Amino acid sequence: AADVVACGRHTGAAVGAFSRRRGFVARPGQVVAEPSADGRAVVLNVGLGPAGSATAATFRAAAAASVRAVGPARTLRLDLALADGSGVPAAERARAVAEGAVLGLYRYDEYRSASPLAEVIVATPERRAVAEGLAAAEATCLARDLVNCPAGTLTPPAFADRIRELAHTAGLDCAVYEGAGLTELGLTGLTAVGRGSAEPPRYVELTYDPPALTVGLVGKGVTFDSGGLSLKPMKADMGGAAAVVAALTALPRLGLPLRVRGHLPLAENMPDGGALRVGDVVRHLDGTTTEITHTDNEGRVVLADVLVRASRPRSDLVVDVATLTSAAVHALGTRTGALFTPDDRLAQTVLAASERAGESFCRLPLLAHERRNLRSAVADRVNCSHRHGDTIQAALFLQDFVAAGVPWAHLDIAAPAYNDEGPYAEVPYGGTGFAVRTLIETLRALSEG
């Protein structure tokens, strides 16, 4: 038997006298606990708001609120997806409730010294949708764990080792490049940025090959970013690599008819007697040059050569994900990512995917007039203009390295990848796993078309 049962209630739905006396008015995520009818167990009444305004995000948030209110129970049954009357179809309700339950239960206690809850059950006939939601949420929590991991544990070599182990679990193809084998690939930005650190850099390629469409995902894996010699105005700057790895791990379970390759440059950015210097010039894999005008804009320099490699003459589409710029957050706020692409059809695909996933993105323009801020007196471009517009300038910088004719999108997720404000809804303090579920929904949509 369930120790606790969570009942979804839209505004106007009947609850008992005790629930009314406690102030239950079905506000989204409001929870009031009471004894079960027979007095042997617990019932949670959980608000879903007005039936007419409810979305999948309402259900996701209500499930997370339910799991947070479980107390010392061993078993919890969520009946939330059985609540009908909203416009959210049964399968969408089931998927969202399953996701919210896993996301809301997430804890990162690995590094504390010194959970009665053994089973969460989602009630619904939509078993496929439950499975899909659990898998998406489990992938999100993998990314959360990677971001939360101290940089001393998750070094570039350790991260490469972890990716290899994850790949083995579905027999994703995995190649790890290190030392002389890495030098051979000509990823000059990665090796230049990574050299100051005592930890050597790594490059990992991770392939799902279950198709007619091949998608390349590029994820920024800076495991610790101190700003280098220039300083910042630090373990979470591998959030892009975390999102890409996690999305790839979810694909074998979903069984999408789509080939997907992950490209993952891993490094630390540290000050040191041998660190990358202001004024240095990097000669990239495509023969073009970048002048290092600020060592804290290292991400774009690392990604450059990987985008050349990923788009070389073959992937039909390349998507990069990176915690790239701080300028983004000033106008967009802390919970919204930035999307760049020249392809309007790809923009709509990514944006609709983010809406299904409950993740907030804003498309920003690849402004031609900001290219003047890439100009260098010495090299082909700079990595920092010291002027306003760095979020757009970084996107334009990356665009230079994507081979002619290859559709491309760039996701700048610096702010929403790490929550330094309190927990809310299904999102914890700290590493969030932001963009995992957007990526999965994007890949699902691309596989259909």
Q: Min. distance of Cβ 430 from its own copies in angstroms?
A: 5
Closer to its own copies by Cβ: residue 402 or 443 = 402
Closer to its own copies by Cβ: residue 168 or 277 = 277
Q: Min. distance of Cβ 338 from its own copies in angstroms?
A: 7
Q: Min. distance of Cβ 349 from its own copies in angstroms?
A: 18
Which of Cl ion, its own copies, none interacts with 373 (beta carbon under 5 to 8 A by kind)?
A: its own copies
| Strand extents, DSSP E, 323-388 | 336-340, 360-363, 381-382
- SS3 string, 72-113, reads CCCEEEECHHHCCCCCCCHHHHHHHHHHHHHHHHCCCCCCCC
> Which H helix or E strand runs over 393?
helix 390-399
Give the β-pairing of 4-9 and 173-177. unpaired
Is 300 noted as a catalytic residue in this protein? yes
Cα–Cα dist 97/58, whole Å = 9
Which of its own copies, Cl ion, none interacts with 299 (beta carbon under 5 to 8 A by kind)?
A: Cl ion
- What residues numbered 110-139 form the site for Cl ion, per CB under 5 A? none
Hey, what are 16's tokens?
């008992």
Closer to Cl ion by Cβ: residue 297 or 442 = 297
CB nearest Cl ion: which residue?
299
Give the β-pairing of 75-78 and 4-9. parallel
Q: Which residues are paired to 266 by β-bridges?
A: 202, 221
Angle at 437 between CA 432 and CA 443, to 5 degrees: 145
Q: Using the rule CB under 5 A, give the single segment among 41-49, 183-191, 295-303, 347-355 that binds Cl ion.
A: 295-303
Hey, what are 247's tokens?
């999305």
Which of its own copies, Cl ion, none interacts with 300 (beta carbon under 5 to 8 A by kind)?
A: Cl ion
Q: Min. distance of Cβ 295 from its own copies in angstroms?
A: 10
Is 235 noted as a catalytic residue in this protein? no
The catalytically annotated residue of 21, 107, 127, 232 is 232
The catalytically annotated residue of 144, 261, 300, 381 is 300
Which of its own copies, Cl ion, none interacts with 278 (beta carbon under 5 to 8 A by kind)?
A: its own copies
Task: Please tell me whether residue 300 binds Cl ion under the rule CB under 5 A.
Answer: yes
Query: Which residues, 6 or more positions from 231, have their beta carbon under 8 angstroms from its beta carbon?
Result: 296
The one-letter amino acid code at 376 reads S
Query: Which residues, 6 or more positions from 31, have their beta carbon under 8 angstroms from its beta carbon?
Result: 6, 44, 45, 46, 47, 65, 66, 68, 69
Q: Min. distance of Cβ 324 from Cl ion in angstroms?
A: 5
Task: Please tell me whether residue 323 binds Cl ion under the rule CB under 5 A.
Answer: no
Of positions 47, 216, 299, 431, contacts Cl ion by CB under 5 A = 299
Going by the annotation, the residues of the binding site are: 220, 225, 237, 296, 298
Active site residues: 232, 300
Residues that bind Cl ion (CB under 5 A): 297, 299-300
